[PDB]
Design a protein around this ligand. Structure first.
Ligand SMILES: O=C(O)c1ccc(-c2nn(Cc3c(Cl)cccc3C(F)(F)F)c3ccc(Cl)cc23)c(OCc2ccccc2)c1
Ligand SMILES: O=C(O)c1ccc(-c2nn(Cc3c(Cl)cccc3C(F)(F)F)c3ccc(Cl)cc23)c(OCc2ccccc2)c1
Lengths: 260, 261
């Protein structure tokens, strides 16, 4: 590829990434630092006032369940956002339809965790397009398996955010995740890896121009995909504990199907 | 109101999801029904013995009409699942109130099943087991007690509906328009549902015009078919409640159980 083409590909993805995702990293960092202040959830009572404040649809019997299920609601929303962005990656829509489904089926969890760090600091997480803020303290302190469902995400995000990537970096990074040629059941891997080679090239040039003073940031960011695979697995294994433990969770079969 | 280029994009988006979500497309169904091919020919079920040989051919305990009736329930549940997956891809649907999401599907899945079952039908019968079987209308109509005429209303609608000669790219938008109906009982926020339907209706009008330029007023004719569906769903529901209060032997799947509450 030629450098001018990698600049063009990077700009393409950044523009799409902004249109696809409601709350950008740049905007989220403005809210967390205090630069319109969000509503803060730190305990039982402020949660009760919050679902009365903005009427969170993710939030509205037991508290720890309602919070867990609110993550699912927002996760379903996010999957669709990623699916739209995926269509703007040059070459993606020309792939075999089964392979498009396969790449998204397996990539979304890694991409959600990555983008969830954009909404997080060491003390909590933004919610509802940045109008809320749920504290790490409150999440960590939830009961039984829910307390320890939330804390691993924060632990990844604090390390990941130490890289100080911006939205133009992340757009290419997320694209690289989607075009992973090692997902189970892919029919035609060659054109997928061909796109990933171009995206990898663009990420490399992007990180060098946008962080010239950061030695081997490219390599350091590819090593975070090691983390991602591990956390996604830990995440999956945790869901199956709730399914086989919680008699409270049985919901509406239709909702169950939406969240399948 | 949108720009034509944006409506074509929405049409292309929905057709692509429809392909990804529904295994047996109308295009594939018509190829098997038309024949000519030797690699796709179905095994045909027209009586007791060919049904018995059929479960040995296609791999499709108790009484025949029941086993047949149960084969429809199984496939309906799968259909509910497929429609739910398609719905999530409709831009804006998953962003709606959670109650309304459930509500739109509760009432819409039957109208959509009937519509898409027409794709699997001609005047003589229906494809089964992902198009590997074909059961004759004659055979269904001749089932006993209340089950005989349980199957027949579907055929009556399908023969008329297939006369519009829609293809999958048209049906994709049509199905979406059905789901995002703002006049379903118990919806909390009709406005955001209606704004989505305006976009889907806009997309449908443009799609039908480009893809059937010589089909005068096909848009309006296709909306007048949404009238039929509402009537057939009611007759269907009322017939199940007869079976439920007659066959205590038989039992319904929880997903369908809930949809009719
Ligand atoms: O606005 C966003 O971009 C956004 C994305 C992700 C989360 C979120 N998801 N999950 C669990 C999870 C993950 Cl991580 C990945 C796939 C599927 C799921 C699951 F289980 F929900 F299905 C979390 C677990 C812990 C935390 Cl603090 C956040 C998440 C999100 O939450 C914001 C949120 C937190 C509390 C209550 C409501 C909403 C937002
Ligand atoms: O391949 C498909 O996409 C497909 C979809 C629908 C049917 C089918 N369902 N039903 C009854 C029904 C309806 Cl209509 C809606 C909700 C719930 C139910 C019920 F009662 F079963 F719970 C039928 C009644 C009459 C007819 Cl000829 C078809 C159907 C279907 O059958 C194909 C089929 C016919 C025989 C044996 C096995 C499968 C297929």
């Amino acid at each position: 590829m030629e450098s001018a083409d990698l600049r063009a590909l990077a700009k393409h993805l950044y523009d799409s990434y902004i249109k696809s995702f409601p709350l950008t990293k740049a905007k989220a960092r403005a809210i967390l630092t205090g630069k319109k202040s969000p509503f803060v959830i730190y305990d039982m009572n402020s949660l009760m006032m919050g679902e009365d404040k903005i009427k969170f649809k993710h939030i509205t019997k037991e508290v720890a369940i309602r919070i867990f299920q609110g993550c699912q609601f927002r996760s379903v929303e996010a999957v669709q956002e990623i699916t739209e962005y995926a269509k703007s990656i040059p070459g993606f829509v020309n792939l075999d339809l089964n392979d498009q489904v396969t790449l998204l089926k397996y990539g979304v969890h890694e991409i959600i965790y990555t983008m969830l760090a954009s909404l997080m600091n060491k003390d909590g997480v933004l919610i509802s397009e940045g109008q809320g803020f749920m504290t790490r303290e409150f999440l960590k302190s939830l009961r039984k398996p829910f307390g320890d469902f939330m804390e691993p995400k924060f632990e990844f995000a604090v390390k990941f955010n130490a890289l100080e990537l911006d939205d133009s970096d992340l757009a290419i990074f997320i694209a690289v995740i989607i075009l992973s040629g090692d997902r189970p059941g892919l029919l035609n891997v060659k054109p997928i890896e061909d796109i990933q080679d171009n995206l990898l090239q663009a990420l490399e040039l992007q990180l060098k121009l946008n962080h010239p003073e950061s030695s081997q940031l490219f390599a350091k960011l590819l090593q975070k995909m090691t983390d991602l695979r591990q956390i996604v697995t830990e995440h999956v294994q945790l869901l199956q504990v709730i399914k086989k433990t919680e008699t409270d969770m049985s919901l509406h079969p239709l909702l169950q199907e939406i969240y399948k």
